[PDB]
Ligand binder design. Sequence first.
Ligand SMILES: *[C@@H](C)C1=C(C)C(=O)N[C@@H]1Cc1[nH]c(/C=C2N=C(/C=C3\NC(=O)C(CC)=C3C)C(C)=C\2CCC(=O)O)c(CCC(=O)O)c1C
Length: 165
Amino acid sequence: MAAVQLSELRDRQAIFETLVAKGRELLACDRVIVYAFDDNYVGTVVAESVAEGWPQARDQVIEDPCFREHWVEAYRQGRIQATTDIFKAGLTECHLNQLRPLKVRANLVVPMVIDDQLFGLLIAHQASEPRQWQEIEIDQFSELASTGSLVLERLHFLEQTIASL
Ligand SMILES: *[C@@H](C)C1=C(C)C(=O)N[C@@H]1Cc1[nH]c(/C=C2N=C(/C=C3\NC(=O)C(CC)=C3C)C(C)=C\2CCC(=O)O)c(CCC(=O)O)c1C
């Protein structure tokens, strides 16, 4: 017994909705969202997860590509970014304006690459208060993101190869 629905589980969103599901439990934060950079430098709305009391940010499509200047390369090397508060970052520039609405008081990012390529990044925002990430929590969370590459690598290839069939 495992519910036919479970066996028929093959939705691309399922595998994605899961990662974030664990992230919340793993990081033990208050809010978490998944975003990637498609061929438009736009934060792809992979999956959005917001704890009770907070609205769904999925209604907000990351307009800021951040592609400008150096940045993508930062993750291309597996750089770790931990900002207790994006408020003390890039002042006098576009940030709080687009970050205030989401009520994101904490910003944590971890690089996720596939076959030496940039796919996306997992972010965890605490809407209740800014928390200092734990050395172990960062590594564990980074592992969760790296895992997605394992699946994507298989599907991304198999899915594409299938069409070439
Ligand atoms: C303002 C939007 C802007 C313009 C215009 C521009 O040309 N550059 C600058 C973009 C920018 N933003 C940061 C800092 C951060 N970026 C992220 C990641 C995101 N971009 C998004 O659109 C979203 C969706 C919510 C995210 C999550 C984050 C988390 C930060 C802050 C944390 C940190 O890195 O400390 C920068 C970096 C500043 C620099 O120039 O070095 C730039 C250029």
